Each structure stands twice: as C-alpha cells, then as structure tokens.
Design a protein around this ligand. Structure first.
Ligand code: HPS
Length: 155
C-alpha cells in the first residue's frame, strides 16, 4: 500500500523543520504523519479552503509572510519578510514547522539558506543545498541575498 504523497520538493531541513512547495489534498495524509504545529507560508495569495480545513482539523497555526514571486533580473527579495519568517522558524515552540511557497525553490530556498548561515555553514555549502532544490530555476539573486544577509541580529 504505497499511498503517502509528500508535497512538491518536500525535504526535512533539520529536527522539527521541513520545506516544500504548495501542499494539495493529495499530500494531507502524508503531512498528518509529521504532527505539524506550524506552517510558514511565503506567498501573498489567500490560503485555499481545502488547506484551511486541513489546518483547522489538525490544529496547525498558519504564519503568512507574503513575498511577491518576481523573475530575474528584477528580483527584490524583501529582507524584512525573510527576517519575520526566521524569527518564527527559530522558536522551537512552533516545531514541527513546514516552510512552503509555490514551488519550494526561491522564497523557501532563501529562508532556508539564511537559517544555514545562522548555523555557520560555509556559503558554498548553503548555495549547493539551494541549487539542489532550485535546479534549472536556480537564481544568482537568491544566492547573493544569502551572501549579503547580515546575521548580527539573530546570533
Ligand atoms: O518562490 P518559490 O519557492 O515558490 O519558487 C518558484 C520558482 C520558480 C517559479 C515560481 C516559484
């Protein structure tokens, strides 16, 4: 009975932290197995009724930090929104937490890369993980955002 379907680009980031693209009803039975307390949602669009009923049924808190989905070379990742998401991500009371965007590549990739910088990973190691998810859609601007991200306020 091969029946569980993780959401698009699903991965475990760390103890209590997951990343993916946008979950749909086919992914709900899999997400139930994780015992989520929180979702960090990085798109501005309203959450669909299907997903809201999943959250309500499972007692999952929704944190929305809407980042516009821009394309290179006109990408302007908002530092403030990433930092608000990081503040929630670093509070273990919110774990287990799923970070998701639409595809789990750009917005999700930036938030995870900034977590890795706080975890003292080498930039080349952060970029390698970012590229594994983003694949042919890897953006230099996402990696430059991580390069210049000042960790001072979170250490
Ligand atoms: O910002 P996201 O993680 O949703 O990732 C993408 C990547 C390519 C196109 C749209 C979205």
């Amino acid at each position: 009975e091969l029946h569980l379907i993780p959401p698009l680009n699903f991965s475990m980031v760390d103890n209590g932290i997951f990343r993916s693209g946008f979950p749909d009803s086919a992914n709900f039975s899999f997400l139930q197995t994780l015992g989520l307390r929180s979702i960090i949602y990085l798109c501005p669009e309203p959450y669909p009724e299907s997903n809201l009923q999943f959250l309500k049924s499972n007692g999952i808190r929704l944190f929305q930090f809407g980042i516009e989905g821009n394309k290179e070379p006109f990408v302007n990742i908002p530092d403030h929104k990433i930092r608000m998401a990081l503040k929630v991500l670093l509070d273990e009371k919110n774990h287990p937490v799923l970070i998701h965007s639409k595809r789990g590549k750009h917005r999700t990739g930036c938030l995870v890369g900034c977590l890795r910088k706080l975890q003292k990973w080498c930039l080349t190691s952060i970029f390698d993980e970012y590229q594994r998810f983003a694949a042919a859609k890897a953006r230099v601007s996402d990696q430059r955002f991580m390069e210049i991200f000042d960790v001072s306020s979170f250490s």
